[PDB]
Write a protein that binds this ligand. Sequence first.
Ligand SMILES: OC[C@H]1O[C@@H](O[C@H]2[C@H](O)[C@@H](O)[C@@H](O)O[C@@H]2CO)[C@H](O)[C@@H](O)[C@H]1O
Ligand SMILES: OC[C@H]1O[C@@H](O[C@H]2[C@H](O)[C@@H](O)[C@@H](O)O[C@@H]2CO)[C@H](O)[C@@H](O)[C@H]1O
Lengths: 478, 380
Amino acid sequence: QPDGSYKLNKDVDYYPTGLDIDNGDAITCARKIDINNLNLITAPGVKVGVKWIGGAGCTTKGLSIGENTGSDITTARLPRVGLLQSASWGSIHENLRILYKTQGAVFIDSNGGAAVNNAYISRLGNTNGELEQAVYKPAGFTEVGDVAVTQFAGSEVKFNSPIIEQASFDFVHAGRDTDSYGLFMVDKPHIESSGGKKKHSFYLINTSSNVTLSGVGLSGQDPDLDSMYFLKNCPETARNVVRGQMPISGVKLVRGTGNYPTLVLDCTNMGSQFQFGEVGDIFYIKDVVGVKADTLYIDPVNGNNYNWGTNGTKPIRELTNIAKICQLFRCKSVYLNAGESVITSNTELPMVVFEGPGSLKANSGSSFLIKAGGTLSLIGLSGISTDGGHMFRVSTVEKVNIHTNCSVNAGAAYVVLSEVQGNIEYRQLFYSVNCSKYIGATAGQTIAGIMVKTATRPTGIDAAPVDGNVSLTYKIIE
Amino acid sequence: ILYKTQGAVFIDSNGGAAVNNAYISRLGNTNGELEQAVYKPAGFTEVGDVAVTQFAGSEVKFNSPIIEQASFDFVHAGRDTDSYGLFMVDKPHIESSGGKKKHSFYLINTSSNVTLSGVGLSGQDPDLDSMYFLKNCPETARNVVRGQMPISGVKLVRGTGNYPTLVLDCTNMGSQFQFGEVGDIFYIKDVVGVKADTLYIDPVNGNNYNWGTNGTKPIRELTNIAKICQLFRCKSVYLNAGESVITSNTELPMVVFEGPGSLKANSGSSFLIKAGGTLSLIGLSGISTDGGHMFRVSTVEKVNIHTNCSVNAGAAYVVLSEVQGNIEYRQLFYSVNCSKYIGATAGQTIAGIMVKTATRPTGIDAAPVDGNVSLTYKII
Ligand SMILES: OC[C@H]1O[C@@H](O[C@H]2[C@H](O)[C@@H](O)[C@@H](O)O[C@@H]2CO)[C@H](O)[C@@H](O)[C@H]1O
Ligand SMILES: OC[C@H]1O[C@@H](O[C@H]2[C@H](O)[C@@H](O)[C@@H](O)O[C@@H]2CO)[C@H](O)[C@@H](O)[C@H]1O
């Protein structure tokens, strides 16, 4: 108080911060408190069940909040917010059971080393759950819908084997504003919801995380907005690591906001997700370990960019991220379904085998980009052409092999343009080829070898197949 | 537990025993660094209080321990006979006032599986303090680190012994490359799911304690650059101004080298090429040797050497193949000097050569390689 004295907090919304405790602004008087099987019910409409504030080292077992009065939640004897906790480092909640209406449990600020084990938190049904407005939450969380567990301001409670039911948002977690401190830790959550109603399971704001999936979960009914994860403004240095087993049924994995990918698949057991689920937004995946697929399928007519693309029955639609996707899952080939797959800006092609009845087209004067060594093969495609730009722009100094066994038309441009001091081998097999020069370079000498085996080629350049910036190692024509 | 010298000590048979949510703290860290552990393995001779000590084959499971104000959070020794006894710590919450600490995990002759929870630190001594200290862990041992590193910079690892055993298993490094230090890179055995595009070198201002993967914290020597690039999948090496030198044969990763620095092999040493791919020196202030052949190739895989800078091997060769090799050498502009561009120690090595510069030893245009090399192409 102003005079210097202290008054017990009676304000319902108040919770002490670590700062408050350091400022002398707050002094906790909560120690040596132990709870075993306490059952707490409230009249409908009561704001908060339990305020676990300043309870460092305090413990709980079988704390049970809320009554399953009946089907209508508006008249059920449970609180809007089950539990609100802060300044409780080292506290332990064993087998906590909460029946809530708006928010299950909220953990804010200092809770270092605190654990919540085998919690069973559930909204009493999901009826109108999507309309509940979170009461205690981080500023970055502006969506409407009930939230089973909310965590922010640097709280890093360990969640072990929680069972979360009937929630719009299973977990909403924000890292500390200043440095993204506060790891989101959930080990094997058992997530379920009637009629598959759900918005997100893990809504992560400015944070890192380590989550192990237990083969249990789902994503909501909205074909566009609902996803297991939503990564909002997670920093470039953050990582949201996913381990374990994906749900049996198809789900949409991730959506987000922000300029940095942070999701990591760490030996994640994908089950049949490639065939029945969706990645959602590939942009947010940072890296993949121990998850491989042989082929990436593209369908410019019937594809869907929400798909993983690694299963033939669920191809993606555009070429934008094909290099990224092949790098992530180590794909050995790309299959182009019938139709023209097109780009309007410079796009990287992975060094793999391209096959299928589709065609590749570079429009708006764009070029396909080769940024890695290896062999790029176009086999039996309906052709590849550009509307004016060079077909392949090489920006790697590593050995590049280009193997075209389909029709090739670069018009007045080159099939290959080396932007560096390159090392390229190009080989055209049958079909046809057209270009002003097969291989060229922007400057300082590029070594190349060439084989052109087709009668349908620009015969006028047989004697001079490459520009002056390219020196030939071999030339097999005629 | 509130203690003065040692919090808890676990010895010999404790199979399947568990210690969950332990809260162990010294009552403050004043003079904590002067405590002498009472019950400890013979291999632990350091001075300082120890929160948890384990040895003689004890393998207690520590789940979410909270450890405070300790010089040493954990001291663990594997069994003397066969290194039996896995050190298991899941999500430790480690803190200490004033950042005072010596080591969090002091591991002797053992393996370990540790998951970090984004909480921790390393001591104030810029040379000796480190999260891990691996003492004589055997070749077959693995000390695996998963989870999130602390937010603030820390020195990750130091050790004694001849075998690297640390493993970064998808470890979330945060901003450690920029604000922290690896400490002693020798002790890292392998890395999974952690990458960096560029390794930075600075022979004048660099510090070998650094990771080297962030431009503001470059390393200093060339000794471990191949190992670092292999570990983190770096695509290039940036040489800050000054001469980066070796005095013993040292391997160079097959990547793009850039920057104003120069490369120099002294004491008759050579740069080693032990992997296929393309080694590119682009725009450097030059590469030269004081007498040894410049690049010694010991791999039979296709090797491309792309030099776009000044090259001077003096009376020696630019490339010497120690095996039956397959090499493509291309010198671009600048200048090149040597007695032969490529040579081989024995039974024929195939090679392709391109030299585009007027400043070269014209006298060997007609015989650019020794007798043990057969040319696939020659563009001069
Ligand atoms: O090169 C820097 C980018 O790396 C991308 O990750 C790659 C990863 O390096 C590679 O090993 C493989 O897993 O493919 C990934 C993506 O295709 C990052 O996603 C990107 O952020 C950059 O850091
Ligand atoms: O070749 C044996 C050595 O491997 C080194 O690890 C390599 C690893 O093989 C490679 O995959 C990548 O991770 O680069 C590492 C560079 O260290 C071990 O460190 C070394 O002890 C040997 O086993």
